[PDB]
Design an enzyme around this catalytic site. Structure first.
Site, PDB file in Angstrom:
ATOM      1  N   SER D  96     -11.837 -61.221  77.649  1.00 23.24           N
ATOM      2  CA  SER D  96     -11.945 -62.540  78.987  1.00 23.24           C
ATOM      3  C   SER D  96     -10.512 -63.136  78.899  1.00 23.24           C
ATOM      4  O   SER D  96      -9.881 -63.824  79.218  1.00 23.24           O
ATOM      5  CB  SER D  96     -12.970 -63.404  79.061  1.00 23.24           C
ATOM      6  OG  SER D  96     -12.758 -64.236  77.184  1.00 23.24           O
ATOM      7  N   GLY D  97      -9.568 -63.007  77.598  1.00 23.75           N
ATOM      8  CA  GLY D  97      -8.532 -64.007  76.923  1.00 23.75           C
ATOM      9  C   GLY D  97      -9.188 -65.981  76.931  1.00 23.75           C
ATOM     10  O   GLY D  97      -8.120 -66.438  77.571  1.00 23.75           O
ATOM     11  N   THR D  98     -10.428 -66.153  77.091  1.00 25.90           N
ATOM     12  CA  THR D  98     -10.790 -66.885  76.691  1.00 25.90           C
ATOM     13  C   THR D  98     -10.081 -68.144  75.121  1.00 25.90           C
ATOM     14  O   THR D  98      -9.700 -68.854  75.989  1.00 25.90           O
ATOM     15  CB  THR D  98     -12.488 -67.083  75.911  1.00 25.90           C
ATOM     16  OG1 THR D  98     -12.822 -66.468  76.472  1.00 25.90           O
ATOM     17  CG2 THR D  98     -12.899 -68.158  75.609  1.00 25.90           C
ATOM     18  N   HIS D 127      -9.012 -84.635  77.973  1.00 31.21           N
ATOM     19  CA  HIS D 127      -9.585 -84.218  77.295  1.00 31.21           C
ATOM     20  C   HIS D 127      -9.396 -82.578  77.417  1.00 31.21           C
ATOM     21  O   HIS D 127      -9.394 -82.374  78.975  1.00 31.21           O
ATOM     22  CB  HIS D 127     -10.956 -84.407  77.875  1.00 31.21           C
ATOM     23  CG  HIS D 127     -12.287 -83.757  76.744  1.00 31.21           C
ATOM     24  ND1 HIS D 127     -12.634 -82.117  77.111  1.00 31.21           N
ATOM     25  CD2 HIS D 127     -13.251 -84.243  75.463  1.00 31.21           C
ATOM     26  CE1 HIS D 127     -13.221 -82.156  75.785  1.00 31.21           C
ATOM     27  NE2 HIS D 127     -13.867 -82.798  75.441  1.00 31.21           N
ATOM     28  N   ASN D 129     -11.134 -79.464  77.861  1.00 30.12           N
ATOM     29  CA  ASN D 129     -12.312 -79.172  78.903  1.00 30.12           C
ATOM     30  C   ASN D 129     -12.850 -79.378  79.314  1.00 30.12           C
ATOM     31  O   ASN D 129     -12.266 -79.307  80.916  1.00 30.12           O
ATOM     32  CB  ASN D 129     -13.160 -78.783  77.272  1.00 30.12           C
ATOM     33  CG  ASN D 129     -14.066 -77.421  78.784  1.00 30.12           C
ATOM     34  OD1 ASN D 129     -15.822 -77.827  78.714  1.00 30.12           O
ATOM     35  ND2 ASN D 129     -14.064 -76.527  78.483  1.00 30.12           N
ATOM     36  N   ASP D 130     -13.265 -81.232  79.403  1.00 28.02           N
ATOM     37  CA  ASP D 130     -12.967 -81.481  81.223  1.00 28.02           C
ATOM     38  C   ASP D 130     -12.643 -81.910  81.857  1.00 28.02           C
ATOM     39  O   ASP D 130     -12.252 -82.354  83.186  1.00 28.02           O
ATOM     40  CB  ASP D 130     -13.644 -83.137  80.135  1.00 28.02           C
ATOM     41  CG  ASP D 130     -15.054 -83.258  79.262  1.00 28.02           C
ATOM     42  OD1 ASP D 130     -15.100 -81.879  78.424  1.00 28.02           O
ATOM     43  OD2 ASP D 130     -15.390 -83.982  78.769  1.00 28.02           O
ATOM     44  N   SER D 138     -13.238 -69.404  82.021  1.00 27.12           N
ATOM     45  CA  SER D 138     -12.220 -68.866  81.083  1.00 27.12           C
ATOM     46  C   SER D 138     -12.570 -67.093  81.832  1.00 27.12           C
ATOM     47  O   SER D 138     -11.348 -66.873  81.955  1.00 27.12           O
ATOM     48  CB  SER D 138     -12.407 -68.682  79.412  1.00 27.12           C
ATOM     49  OG  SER D 138     -13.026 -67.162  78.782  1.00 27.12           O
ATOM     50  N   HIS D 186      14.351 -23.149  89.882  1.00 25.21           N
ATOM     51  CA  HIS D 186      13.881 -22.020  88.775  1.00 25.21           C
ATOM     52  C   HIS D 186      15.170 -22.602  87.348  1.00 25.21           C
ATOM     53  O   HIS D 186      15.084 -21.766  86.605  1.00 25.21           O
ATOM     54  CB  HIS D 186      13.570 -21.236  88.880  1.00 25.21           C
ATOM     55  CG  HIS D 186      12.740 -20.884  90.145  1.00 25.21           C
ATOM     56  ND1 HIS D 186      11.454 -21.076  90.564  1.00 25.21           N
ATOM     57  CD2 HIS D 186      13.212 -20.377  91.231  1.00 25.21           C
ATOM     58  CE1 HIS D 186      10.844 -20.672  90.921  1.00 25.21           C
ATOM     59  NE2 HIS D 186      11.642 -20.110  91.917  1.00 25.21           N
ATOM     60  N   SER D 316      30.946 -38.281  69.625  1.00 22.48           N
ATOM     61  CA  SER D 316      31.353 -37.157  69.301  1.00 22.48           C
ATOM     62  C   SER D 316      32.530 -36.994  70.157  1.00 22.48           C
ATOM     63  O   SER D 316      33.544 -38.085  69.947  1.00 22.48           O
ATOM     64  CB  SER D 316      30.306 -35.744  69.573  1.00 22.48           C
ATOM     65  OG  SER D 316      28.888 -36.525  69.664  1.00 22.48           O
ATOM     66  N   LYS D 317      33.032 -35.201  74.288  1.00 19.70           N
ATOM     67  CA  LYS D 317      31.512 -35.022  74.321  1.00 19.70           C
ATOM     68  C   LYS D 317      31.741 -36.663  74.195  1.00 19.70           C
ATOM     69  O   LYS D 317      32.004 -37.509  73.583  1.00 19.70           O
ATOM     70  CB  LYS D 317      31.055 -34.397  72.745  1.00 19.70           C
ATOM     71  N   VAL D 318      30.005 -37.250  74.852  1.00 18.84           N
ATOM     72  CA  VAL D 318      29.521 -37.984  75.194  1.00 18.84           C
ATOM     73  C   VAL D 318      28.125 -38.044  75.689  1.00 18.84           C
ATOM     74  O   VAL D 318      27.355 -37.360  76.493  1.00 18.84           O
ATOM     75  CB  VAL D 318      30.035 -38.510  76.812  1.00 18.84           C
ATOM     76  CG1 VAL D 318      29.155 -39.592  77.251  1.00 18.84           C
ATOM     77  CG2 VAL D 318      32.163 -37.959  76.876  1.00 18.84           C
ATOM     78  N   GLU D 324      18.415 -41.098  77.907  1.00 20.86           N
ATOM     79  CA  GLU D 324      17.458 -40.904  76.859  1.00 20.86           C
ATOM     80  C   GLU D 324      17.157 -42.780  76.784  1.00 20.86           C
ATOM     81  O   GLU D 324      15.453 -42.939  75.985  1.00 20.86           O
ATOM     82  CB  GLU D 324      18.176 -40.804  75.173  1.00 20.86           C
ATOM     83  CG  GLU D 324      18.864 -39.369  75.183  1.00 20.86           C
ATOM     84  CD  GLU D 324      19.690 -39.352  74.040  1.00 20.86           C
ATOM     85  OE1 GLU D 324      20.077 -40.101  73.278  1.00 20.86           O
ATOM     86  OE2 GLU D 324      20.024 -38.386  74.208  1.00 20.86           O
TER      87      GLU D 324
END
Lengths: 411, 453, 454, 456
Positions: D96-98, D127, D129-130, D138, D186, D316, D317-318, D324
């Protein structure tokens, strides 16, 4: 023209020329889903189990040989593929494969009734549940049929196909070993290797795939049969599990065995997930080989121009030969990658005593096997054996390379 | 008995019975791969393109009405499903769909010839390449037929199937609106909600799934036709691209258009990846719904026991739930294949067309058929087990919070722990502990006031 | 302050307290992609290859022991993980892993230089290319390091983690063997089995997974080293392939070998796809186990109520029932991550071109992530969930006596069933209260312990 | 040194320099899994929700201004990325990610207490929570934070990165529009097109991806906040759902709304599966583009040799290293999509408990694709140069252009030219002029590539 068939739900009319019964007829109406009927390899495997069960039930004194021998003969017709038209149900049915198990019971029962001169649909003297389904549940019979079918198709179709491909690639290694060409890394010009050496990579990938598949077969050959409804073996005779596996082995000529743990064999099909991983790895290997060949055959003039691939379908521009066998194979390999994802997900989705994704897993596995065996044969016969090297193009490119040759292909 | 058909390779025999020609006959031998023939939706759409091309070609003065009119009628039979048996080719063919394009050209040409009283196999007076294939290429026709089939099957099969399911769910929302049950979060007992509210979630998932699919349609409706071989439109008349798309739109009653960029339309099929993305998301929603229902119907004694599901087969196995969930997982696999094929275009042309068409269309067919079957054979007949639900509601510890206002946190907590330890109800620990009278318990603990803001 | 470093492209400034050189510094600027640096296991494995290559090059008389001995000591520091801050490169780089190979050459060279009292950045007396990279290519070193890393983590992390879980499952099999419960098929009530038997399925799935993984290791232990640039072995001494593999085996304590076909070893990584297939199958097995336990521990009152799972996170005093199956959730999440990794790795495995597959870092990252998560999550689910699982015996017994499954005298067995079903009562209340049989006849007949075997 | 923090399980020591509390500290030992911490976009979004909730609670008269104003300022520091080192928890936690919600409560509360000159660890006067978690659960907060983060990163990172790439592709369309090359179908030689036309395809793929992603954003902007534990909204003030969404919209500058059905919003995240399907489609498009450019740049002498790609590293060409990186990233997204989809299917009843997994995969996809798109643009696309002499030379060597002679010399004599050129290894000119089918001047008159690149 019909006869009336009955089950606990009531009566239902079945076409007189059909061997199936009430349950199968009900499933036709209840599961109108998709194009795909049960693979014929599963139909055959259900025949093998009904035949082996009869033999084991007779040997263990549970079944009248008058009834049993008729079951055996009737099931042989299923095994031999003579009754394929009497299996009309789709893959997309109850996840334990109950409908198809009952389809097999009904067909074997009605055909055996016919052989004994009884009345079809009456369940006498061969009852679909009491005799054909004796000592079994659908829960253990369908998964057994799955493993049999999967092993059989791997052993008789896929593995010979791959060996055929391997042999053709080895011929090319020998034929092309004197041909020196330019390597490509990152797609850029690099140092030399022979075309024979490049092809030896392809051959080695195929041989390795063969070995990976083979290694997974012992898992596949362990059978759920005898676990009955939840894995305890309740309502099966003592010794049935072992005996029915021996009977299955004797019918198929394959070393099938009884699974050491029936709870594992019912609640999960991890052996199929692992075996399909070997087929998944084979598809990646074949994809690469087919894709390389595709590109090496590109041109005739603006491509890489190393290979001349056979022309299978008619031309008109001159020299323009589409690598259509590479296309069929690479498409097949991607299908397999998708099948592997579905098969894996299904394998994770067992609940408590039973995985109810059986028909889905059997269908995906058998499709992968069929596709790869077929495409491997087609790619071999219609592409690989006829491949020629364009030696002048390969020379002309090497002599015009910046990269620098018989002294450059060794350690 | 056979008829001799001819191509640049030479002659080949075709059953006199069959309308196909040399190319199709050859492809039978060259591609002996798998179980799957081209989807019949693809056959129909190919018929549609050939009909539309002939009309477009005639209106542009390129095609003689004597030939064109015969083509149009021959193609109408393909469109209507009458010639399905004349397309014997597999999915696993040339990646542009060339062989099936040729199959369509040959079938339409031969049937057209027969309509004109000519000799089949002679390519006269209707030539498969020169007339049926006029102004087109395999490269631009098969992907056009792909999009037509995919859009048609979504519009006519999947969308109405999901709407049918949505209605059946909304009915259950209304029927179950008065039933208060215990929620489950992490599978643990939680605060209450109505069975109606829970089903309103399922309905909303289906309703959202429909809108997601619809949104992807405009992209599917853009057609490659007129790009010809490489996207440039060489060998198509000026105006052909636009005209043929209009003709297709008229044939189908769907708003097909010509793609604004023909290179994007041949080299890639991203709009199919995106659409199937909506299908994939619908499979995930449907899976969760069927899996929920499966578990809510578990029992009859040692499960959750909230729903009674209709029994269809001779304790009720949720077999329709099982069919639907298998179908949804198939779609997840199909989506991976379709996505990868989509990535694999080379230069001017994607050559994974049949694979993509097969996967997309299979998903649509399975999802549509399973949605309908799940609706008719499961959803409509679902009954709530109200006695079971109420019993569970009364045995739950979740409602303790409602006592806290009047009696304080520490006392409510003491009620709950004692109830938890003893195996008893809150009422038994509240009233039997003197904290509250039975009159006050019924006045304070009101589940109907705990299912809203 | 910064040290000037040099490659064929030109000079570039490197922070003075870092050991990496010009090619590393360039890649840092060129590949600003993602959160993920190269897995430390790969860094270690690169050190292993450099150490082994130096020893192999000395034994074949290509490398001067003065230079070689310093390389070994420098590589040792990389192997021991002492130089991890000197590898700043992402996974999402060149597909051969060239830049990480160079990162390794440059770090080992500069450290060995500093060990010999020379000047860092000068390539003397230890040259990153001519000495540290001697006889090798990026094309054969990175894939070699991949395989070492993957094999090391499977052997030292994943397999022990799986054996640990199996052992814990086997203890629950013994503990729960006496507890008879109702089976569930299609999620419907079914015939009895013991909780021990159910847990023996889980234990067997883990043991089978261990075997599947082990069977793939020989393939993983075949190394590309010695194939050099395109697979021919060019610019590596005769016998280097065999020797360096021997050196790597000596260092790791694992039976690595030289791959019998170097073309196959560079152009494809099929053996990683296959090994990851075992891990994929393991994740499916673990997923089902964790998911079952999640549902079996559900409740306390409106669930299945068979298991009591350890509560590891604080609850409320007013919620004495609620225990969230949080270890189950961590594990199932991990398993699903592995399914994704397997798809990517497979696809990458198909995408080699000619002599080289250039998706190496992607595949290394996915494989190693899978191994790390599965090993960690298996450890955590074992210690923090499995060992502390208790069966809710009274609940399971109450369920077993309220069941309608033990019906299988007369044949109003179906009528007793259908009445109890209709009335919401028990089988006892209708079989005895309905006058069909006595209590002692009911108790002699309805016996679950006779219904759990053949 | 350490500070004693307490929950219902008892006391636990927290490093004195850290703002988190007891539940965050317990989560460190309970979930020792993996390398990955909660993405920083989630941390930021948790900050946003806490600030939005405080403002919403004050406006509804349920929270004292002396308390909330402190929460607001403390939560701002979370939002600004100033308190990142105080969220040490992994992705692989409770579904839940609590634990991360609790982390945000504790960090916000302790910093708020500090700003008020109170005692950290005392929960006074703020607080966790409060006060910080007032009107919340959550179950409804972490998925709200998830949607906020995903939408923010798509809107601020991915969409601009893609427009940047589109812009650079359109430059190349204009630059290469005069250059006629041989098409490939092709992988075989085919009829001509311009390099500009080819790039116009790539550019239209990118523009299309942008539209696809945008279209999925309204779905992502619907928030679960206010559904509380199970969807009913119990323990939230009437109108909290609407107001907190408004407050979130105001903080972010993004059109967030309250989800019309909270049970759908809690039990499933199909909106994320759908949006990530747009991201999945984009990765497929970008993979294809980069793969093409890779191959077109191949050589320099034995490849296709059409394109000269900038040289960033040896070399190296490249070596096409940016292609990638981008292709690897795209395959990563395909894998993420499969995991994300499957997680999406796995909801149980009122709650889907695969939230951190889905959040992680989505945000990784977004980060990697945005980063790689930018890098590919800057370090490859903008510097791409056509090798015009190579391309022209292949264009003249090609057999594909015989079709232009067909109307003048007939369909059978053109083929005879082509086959002979094919067998001899000669050009179309040498065989057409040298066989007396056409004069040199006629050949240049009919065989004109620039007339074969459009409708005909």
């Amino acid at each position: 023209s019909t006869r009336t068939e009955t089950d606990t739900f009531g009566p239902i009319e079945v076409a007189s020329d059909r061997y199936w019964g009430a349950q199968a007829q009900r499933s036709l109406g209840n599961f109108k889903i998709g194009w795909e009927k049960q693979p014929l390899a599963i139909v055959r495997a259900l025949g093998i189990v009904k035949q082996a069960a009869a033999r084991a039930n007779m040997a263990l004194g549970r079944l009248d040989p008058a009834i049993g021998d008729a079951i055996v003969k009737a099931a042989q017709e299923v095994i031999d593929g003579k009754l394929d038209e009497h299996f009309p149900l789709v893959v997309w049915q109850t996840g334990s494969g109950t409908q198809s198990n009952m389809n097999a019971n009904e067909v074997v029962s009605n055909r055996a009734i016919e052989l004994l001169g009884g009345v079809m649909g009456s369940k006498k003297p061969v009852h679909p549940n009491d005799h054909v389904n004796m000592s079994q549940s659908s829960n253990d019979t369908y998964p057994t049929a799955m493993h049999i079918a999967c092993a059989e198709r791997v052993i008789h179709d896929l593995l010979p196909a791959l060996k055929h491909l391997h042999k053709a690639l080895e011929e090319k290694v020998k034929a092309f070993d004197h041909i020196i060409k330019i390597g490509r890394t990152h797609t850029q010009d690099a140092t030399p290797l022979t075309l024979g050496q490049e092809f030896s990579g392809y051959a080695a990938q195929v041989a390795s795939s063969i070995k990976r598949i083979e290694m997974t077969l012992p898992g596949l050959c362990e059978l759920a049969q005898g676990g009955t409804a939840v894995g305890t073996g309740l309502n099966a005779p003592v010794g049935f599990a072992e005996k029915v596996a021996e009977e299955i082995a004797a019918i198929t000529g394959i070393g099938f065995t009884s699974a050491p743990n029936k709870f594992e064999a019912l609640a999960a099909h991890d052996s199929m997930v692992f075996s399909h991983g070997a087929i998944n790895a084979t598809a990646a290997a074949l994809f690469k080989i087919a894709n390389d060949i595709r590109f090496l055959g590109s041109g005739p003039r603006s491509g890489l121009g190393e290979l001349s691939l056979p022309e299978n379908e008619p031309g008109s521009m001159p020299g323009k030969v589409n690598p259509t066998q590479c296309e069929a194979l690479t498409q097949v390999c991607v299908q397999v990658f998708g099948n592997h994802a579905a098969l894996t997900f299904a394998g994770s989705q067992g609940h408590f005593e039973l995985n109810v994704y059986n028909p889905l897993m059997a269908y995906n596995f058998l499709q992968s096997v069929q596709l790869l065996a077929d495409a491997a044969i087609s790619f071999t016969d219609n592409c690989v054996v006829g491949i020629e090297a364009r030696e002048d193009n390969i020379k002309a490119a090497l002599d015009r390379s910046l990269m620098l040759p018989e002294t450059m292909i060794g350690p």
